[PDB]
Each structure stands twice: as C-alpha cells, then as structure tokens.
Design a protein around this ligand. Structure first.
Ligand SMILES: Nc1nc2c(ncn2[C@@H]2O[C@H](COP(=O)(O)OP(=O)(O)OP(=O)(O)O)[C@@H](O)[C@H]2O)c(=O)[nH]1
Ligand SMILES: O=C([O-])C(=O)[O-]
Ligand SMILES: [Mn+2]
Ligand SMILES: [Mn+2]
Ligand code: NA
Length: 612
C-alpha cells in the first residue's frame, strides 16, 4: 500500500507495536510522527516494569531526583518560566467567537480566550513541524473515569516528555488495557510537545525542556483535539485533567446532557451511620483538596474522598445526580499541607509520589512553606531553585504552586465507591471561595435557580477580589451564558432529585486581618449543618441571602472563642454593593447571553436586600 515506505514508522518503535493499535489510533500516531519527527516511538503499556524503566531513564538523564527518605518518591525541579497554567496562552478554537465566550462590552473577556481556526493553523505550523527531533514520542492510551464505566471517556496523548508519561500513569488509567477497552471507538486526540527539538536552539534551564515564548495550550472541540506546545507543567501537559476533563468535556456535557465541573466529591457519614455524597466547587487556592480529604474534628463523623478536583455528573434513570471522579490520582498543591491542615494527604504522599518544585532536605525528604514539621538541628534545605536555603531568606523554599502527584488508591480514606462505574449520588453542591468581608460562614440557596445564581455570582480574593463563577473561570469549554442556561435546564428534567445548594466562606476576617473561623477539620461542623438540612431539619433562619444556621444550630463546642456575631453577620450596605457589582459584571461580561432566570435572581436578591 506504498511506493516507498508510506508513513510506516515501525523501524522507530522501541516499545510495543504499531500493528497492535486500533486503525485510527495508528493514523493519529503515524501522522504526528511524520509531522514532529521523533527519533523513537514508545507505545506505553502502563506496566510497573515500564514505569520503573521510565523513572530510571529520567533519573539517569538528571531530569528527576530520587527522594531517598521515602518509598519510591521523586522530585522534579522546573525552569521557573514554566511553573503554572498560563491563562493568556490557553485558547479554544471554534468557527464563531461567541460560541466559546460571550462578547464583553468592554472588549476584555474574563470568561475564556477564543482563537480563530486561521490563526491557530498559523500558530500550529510555526511550532509543531520537527518539534520532537532527537526525542522519543510516547503514546499514552488513557481513560478518564473508571475503565469501562458508561461515564468514562478515552484519550490518546502523544508527548515527548517522560515526566508527562510518569504523571499521566498516576493521574489517569493508562496502558494496554485502555487500548483494549477502546477498540475501534472514538477517542480525544491529545498532542503535546515541550517544543525543544534537538539540537537545542536555546540553553536548558534546570534540565527542564520548555519553550515559554511559544507556549500555546489549544482546544479544538469540533475536531475532538487538544494541542499543547511549549510547557511541561502539569495543567498544560497532562492533557487529561484540565484540557480534556474540564474544557473539552464541559462542551461534550452541554451537548449530551451532563456536567463536567471543578468540584471535589466526598462521602460523609454521620454518627448514626447515614452517608451522603457532596460536591464542592471552590477556585484554585481555596481548599478543595483539604475538604475532600478532611479529618473531621467532630466525634463519630467520617469523610471519605471520591475525588479532589474534577467531577463528571449525570442524572440517572431514577433522578439521582450521579458523580464520578474522572481522575486516578491527586495533583495537589504542596505548600500549606501539614498534619494540621491535611493529615490524610500527608499519609497518601509518602510513597509512589512525584513532587514538582518543592524543597529537598539534606536527608532526602521534602519541604515547603506550611509543612509545620521541625527539622533536626543540622538538617539543611535545598530550595526548588536548587540553591541552599534558610528560613530568613526573602523567597520561599518551594514554589507557591508546587505540587504532589500521588495515586488516589493510596489515600487512607479513599471512598469505596471512588471507582464505581455508575457514580455516587450527590445530595448537596457547595460553592465558595475567599471573601475577607461580608459573606458569612455558610448559607443555603432558596431554590435551584437561586443556587445557580449563587454559583454564577462567586467571587474570590486572588490579587484582589475577582469573579470566578462555579470555580470555572479558567475552564469553560464554551460560552458561559449558555453554561448557565445548561445548569438552569436541570430543573426541567422530570423527577430530577436536585441537590440542595450551599455557599461557604472559610476566609472571613475581622478588622485586624484575623480569620474568624478556624477551618480545616472544624469545617466538619458546617458539613453537619448541611447534612441536617438535606434531612429537612428545622435548623435554618431565613435571611435576604438565603438560609443560615439558627442561633445554637451549629455545634461550636470547643470553639467558645468564635465571634459568632461577626462571622454570621449580614450588612445591608455590603450586600447592596455586592448586588451593584454583580450587575455590572454580568452586563459587561455576559450581556445578551445571560439567561432570564439569572437576571430574575439578581433582581430578587436586590429586592430582599432593599427590605432590610
Ligand atoms: N483559613 C483556611 N484556609 C484554608 C482552609 N482550607 C484550605 N485553606 C487554604 O487553602 C489553600 C490550599 O488550597 P489549595 O490546595 O491550593 O486549593 P484547591 O482548591 O485544592 O486548588 P487546586 O488544586 O489548584 O484546584 C491554603 O492556603 C490553605 O491554608 C480553611 O478551612 N481555612
Ligand atoms: O490549577 C488547578 O486548579 C489545578 O491544577 O487543580
Ligand atoms: Mn487541589
Ligand atoms: Mn483545580
Ligand atoms: Na530539573
């Protein structure tokens, strides 16, 4: 079927066989091998043997270091230009701009970043041809969701980064069993390169290949493709997680009747043995992983983790909102993780875990701001910049967005249904983020439509207070106004069991800057209130913003120093300015795409505030 050797890359395969691949997977591999010109093709099998050899290869090449204090843990230190997601280099391609993002009246959208097909083809051709020369193209067959679950979706990621292969093995289900479950079905095409073909055109920093100037993380939902160039950093290179399981999946979800969300999923059991599952959307840096893995301070309660970051949710035939965690691991922020703030994370990450951009102690352990573990006198610290470091120094020892990447199976409180293919039944959905003033510890939405407004109106402090609706602002796969209409439409599904919606604020401060609520495992007292409210307990007082706990409804035993008047207070003046601000934002940023029911909820809140 060829006049020379066709596009047959068999001679370059150093693991597996191109002949073993489904036809359309082979076409995707060979077309991109032609384009990108890798030296080798490695078809990943997901085996332990393969993982061992991969880690050895990286260690021998100086790309990662073994952390000798622990069982099979590893440390990567990146070029400091490649440490986080780059929103401004993250784009979605569609025929029409407005299908991706509403058109902002001000000319600056906060809700996504569109690129035309024409501009993208130019950007692609300026980056990918020959980009893998001298490197290995790894072929990662992966499932998002339990292997074979009706809610799961398969991708193929091609990458030139063994760091991406190792981290994908932890964060997804990957290898031959996925190829077998795939057969001749559809898959999301995921193409990644660090963008540094050999011979190197620019010097490597910290032995970490990347191309910051040409970094581009693109999503082509109408082609079912994700194409990412120039960054090796997690959210940009592990294409299953944010690219696929939020941006592409949210659009698929809109078309197919389900939801793909930046939500943890936890199961909570009370002292009577009754168990409920809850989902919660908080922005990055606002504590999802702590809540998901909570060690409750209240006696007789238990929390178990289904996932800490992404939820795929669909109503079943009985009307339950069923949720799965499409991930296979936790890619969690390391700084601030301690026995105090997340003891179950500390237990999970002591074996089989890859750390990126944390500090290293002289006895081969890990360190970061907030770890709250004293070192023995004499033990020294190497920062994430590979310099000696001491606590007086101007800069932190770990990057503030440094991460662990750890298997979910390992977590001592992983829920027994964390891989159940039908998902877990969600009875409450929680929104929240960082509000230093005005917003009380917890309230309950008055209706589904009020609850969708509460998600839509979310704001959180990060370089000042900014809108982050549904905790999805970096992640919408399509126009946010349409996303709101999709959520609202869930109310019209016959016999839907609509979860109760809450909003929390762990971050309210007094006039001195001091947190009013101790948080962490004490948040169990808030979850107890939610649980009772889902049970229909008469534990709520009506206010203009929704229901709050009655006086004495929260268990505050052991917290007598809490300033309940300040923590629970609602000011007419604060809320008048809040509605003022929400109205300006929705008009500027959503305008013609704003659903009527959102506008009505905004008017209803304003009216309730007016009667204060
Ligand atoms: N005061 C207070 N801070 C909290 C609480 N829970 C978490 N935090 C803070 O939240 C931060 C940790 O949250 P992250 O792990 O970055 O948040 P995340 O939502 O998991 O973020 P992504 O993994 O990026 O999606 C740290 O600053 C913690 O101190 C709480 O109950 N009270
Ligand atoms: O950036 C994030 O939200 C993350 O990696 O989870
Ligand atoms: Mn997290
Ligand atoms: Mn996240
Ligand atoms: Na490095």
């Amino acid at each position: 079927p060829q006049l020379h050797n066709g596009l047959d890359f068999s001679a370059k395969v150093i693991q597996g066989s191109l002949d073993s691949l489904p036809q359309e997977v082979r076409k995707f591999v060979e077309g991109n091998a032609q384009l990108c010109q890798p030296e080798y093709i490695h078809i990943c099998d997901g085996s332990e043997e393969e993982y061992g050899r991969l880690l050895a290869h990286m260690q021998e090449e100086g790309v990662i270091r073994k952390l000798k204090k622990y069982d099979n843990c590893w440390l990567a230190l990146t070029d400091p230009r490649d440490v986080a997601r780059i929103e401004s280099k993250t784009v979605i391609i569609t025929q029409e701009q407005r299908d991706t993002v509403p058109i902002p009246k001000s000319g600056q959208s906060q809700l996504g970043r569109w690129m035309s097909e024409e501009d993208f083809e130019k950007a692609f051709n300026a980056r990918f041809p020959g980009c893998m020369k001298g490197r290995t193209m790894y072929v990662i067959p992966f499932s998002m969701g339990p292997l074979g679950s009706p809610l799961a979706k398969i991708g193929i990621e091609l990458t030139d980064s063994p760091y991406v292969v190792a981290s994908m093995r932890i964060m997804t289900r990957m290898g031959t069993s996925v190829l077998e479950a795939l057969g001749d079905g559809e898959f999301i095409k995921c193409l990644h390169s660090v963008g540094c073909p050999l011979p190197l055109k620019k010097p490597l920093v910290n032995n970490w290949a990347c191309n910051p100037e040409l970094t581009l993380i693109a999503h082509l939902p109408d082609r079912r493709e994700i194409i990412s160039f120039g960054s090796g950093y997690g959210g940009n290179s592990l294409l299953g997680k944010k690219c696929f399981a939020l941006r592409i999946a949210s659009r698929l979800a809109k078309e197919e009747g389900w939801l793909a969300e930046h939500m943890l999923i936890l199961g909570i059991t009370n002292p009577e043995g009754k168990k409920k599952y809850l989902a919660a959307a908080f922005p990055s840096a606002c504590g999802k992983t702590n809540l998901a893995m909570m060690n409750p301070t209240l006696p007789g309660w238990k929390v178990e983790c289904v996932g800490d970051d992404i939820a795929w949710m669909k109503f079943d035939a009985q009307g339950n909102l069923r949720a799965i965690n499409p991930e296979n691991g936790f890619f969690g922020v390391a700084p601030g993780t301690s026995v105090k703030t997340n003891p179950n994370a500390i237990k999970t990450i002591q074996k089989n875990t890859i750390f990126t951009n944390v500090a290293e102690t002289s006895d081969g352990g890990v360190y970061w701001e907030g770890i709250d573990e004293p070192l023995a006198p004499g033990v020294t610290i190497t920062s994430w910049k590979n310099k000696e470091w001491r606590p007086q120094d101007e800069e932190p020892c770990a990057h503030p967005n440094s991460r662990f990447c750890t298997p979910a199976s390992q977590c001592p409180i992983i829920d027994p249904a964390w891989e159940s293919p039908e998902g877990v039944p969600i009875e409450g959905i929680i929104f929240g983020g960082r509000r230093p003033a005005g917003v009380p510890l917890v309230y309950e939405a008055l209706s589904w439509q009020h609850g969708v407004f509460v998600g839509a109106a979310m704001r959180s402090e990060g370089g000042g207070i900014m809108h982050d609706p549904f905790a999805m602002r970096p992640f919408f796969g399509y126009n946010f106004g349409k996303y709101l209409a999709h959520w609202l439409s869930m109310a019209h599904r016959p016999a839907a069991k609509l979860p109760k919606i809450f909003h929390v604020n762990w971050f309210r401060k007094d006039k001195n800057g001091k947190f009013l609520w101790p948080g962490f495992g004490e948040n169990s007292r808030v979850l107890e209130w939610m649980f009772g409210r889902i049970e229909g307990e008469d534990s709520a007082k009506l206010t203009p913003i929704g229901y709050v706990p009655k006086e004495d409804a929260l268990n505050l035993k052991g917290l007598g120093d809490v300033n309940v008047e300040e923590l629970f207070g609602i000011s007419k003046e604060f809320w008048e300015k809040e509605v003022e601000e929400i109205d300006k934002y929705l008009e500027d940023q959503v305008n013609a795409d704003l659903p009527y029911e959102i506008e009505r909820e905004l008017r209803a809140l304003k009216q309730r505030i007016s009667q204060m």
